Design a protein around this ligand. Structure first.
Ligand SMILES: O=C(Nc1ccccc1)Nc1cccnc1
Ligand SMILES: O=C(Nc1ccccc1)Nc1cccnc1
Lengths: 263, 265
């Protein structure tokens, strides 16, 4: 990987692996999400970072509040996928990380993603506004003019998500993370939540349709010893409403929507 | 990746990813196992497989793992480049063996090694069988003729019998189920997922104070995507050794058995 000529974005090529593909011999949305997370970490490494000289002195961390991914063509096993990522301040609210996925051979855009990040004290777990020091050190690595992966005014990534009303049409109960689901800080990987949302989608849908759009809100983090229940109801192409909650008290951890197109 | 000058082995370099590392900022044994499986697939692709031969496809025969043995000396850190070399070898009518050598791309030193035993099986009836002459000749043109062993030692750890864990287990992890990310392109549970399930019942205090050095895993039965697994562990022993057992949550049907050797950090 490498930063572009202007230093305001980062590019990396990936060869799709045999264990990264699904039943259609193409990469899964979780493999795609892992790659967006990989190019995001390599972009932060190349510019001297989530950890900053001001966030580290205050014990502040960036936490995902929302993820939106739109895939037009999933790369096949052995294909090369080029990803371009960049950051942007959004005033005091937080930061946004956007991605463009391209087919390395044709140059065609095959996907796009956007994510919203909020500040939080790592010890207290309390949300915060972005102060003037972290904002100043971020604007040196970000384009000053707005650069949006989803430019459309009032697009799908900015739409509110309702709460699934019981009873759910479909469900997957007793979902638990294992060590491969944790990251280097022993926290559940944000990609694992995507897979848990999708566990309650019927296999008949997965076999006849392809995932086109997914929007995921992150409300609470699941601890390594927590148990999750994934719920799904058809709202309609096929559209679904999703809800992740703790198996016991019913505490909400995530909510989302998925759009699927017939193969 | 590319086949070596002689065409009897395959080499591929891998940059270790941020999501592939554990609490020690180094690659997990499951990430390592996924990479051995990746270079194994790219070796089969480069020599003309789809990893079945023409005779195997005509008879509905597939290769199934019977045993996996991995020994790691140094786990590659996040961002490091790891070079892996793999090769196959016939073992008469018993089956085939795939061996690997892991090296640090910068220094050239060997940081790990692995060996695996594969048996022939009819994909439809699930019945195991001996390797026929025609199959043996088809892959011998891609294998070294002189023996080349990743674990050369006459009495080595990869050829030792594994006993069955006697109840009650010292530690346990119950209700382990595969999700879609645990299945492969044929909708079968990925053989690496079994390694993670074995390790789920190892205490977290062992994982935090020790490092996994050796793991031997026998594969007895395949877990279906709708099956539920129970992982069991008992300490058999500075180093720590464990006995492992994977079985179906209900009837107790055995799917895997193994051993792990851990050394103090
Ligand atoms: O992109 C990230 N997470 C993610 C991506 C896709 C889906 C779910 C989660 N993480 C990240 C970390 C450090 C810097 N930039 C990004
Ligand atoms: O070696 C393989 N699997 C594996 C590796 C390490 C641990 C567990 C499983 N797969 C494979 C498939 C086709 C050709 N060569 C190798």
């Amino acid at each position: 990987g490498s930063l572009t000529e202007d230093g305001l974005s980062y590019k990396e090529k990936f060869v799709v692996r045999s264990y990264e593909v699904g039943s259609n011999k193409t990469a899964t949305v979780e493999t795609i999400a892992n790659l967006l997370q990989e190019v995001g970490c390599n972009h932060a490494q190349s510019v001297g970072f989530a950890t900053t000289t001001t966030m580290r002195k205050l014990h502040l961390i960036w936490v995902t509040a929302r993820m939106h991914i739109e895939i037009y063509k999933y790369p096949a096993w052995g294909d090369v996928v080029e990803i371009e990522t960049w950051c942007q301040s959004e005033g005091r609210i937080g930061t946004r990380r956007d991605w463009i996925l391209k087919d390395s051979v044709t140059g065609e855009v095959t996907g796009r993603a956007t994510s919203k990040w909020v500040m939080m004290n790592q010890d207290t777990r309390r949300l915060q506004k972005v102060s003037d020091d972290v904002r100043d050190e971020y604007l040196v690595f970000c384009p000053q003019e707005p650069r949006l992966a989803f430019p459309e005014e009032n697009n799908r990534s900015l739409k509110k998500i309702p709460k699934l009303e019981d009873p759910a049409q479909y469900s997957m109960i007793g979902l638990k993370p294992r060590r491969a689901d944790l990251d280097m800080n022993q926290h559940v990987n944000n990609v694992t939540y995507i897979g848990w949302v999708l566990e309650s989608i019927p296999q008949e849908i997965v076999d006849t349709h392809e995932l086109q759009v997914i929007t995921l809100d992150y409300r609470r983090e699941c601890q390594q010893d927590d148990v999750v229940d994934s719920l799904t109801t058809t709202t309609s192409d096929s559209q679904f409403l999703h809800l992740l909650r703790l198996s016991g008290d019913g505490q909400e951890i995530n909510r989302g929507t998925t759009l699927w197109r017939k193969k």
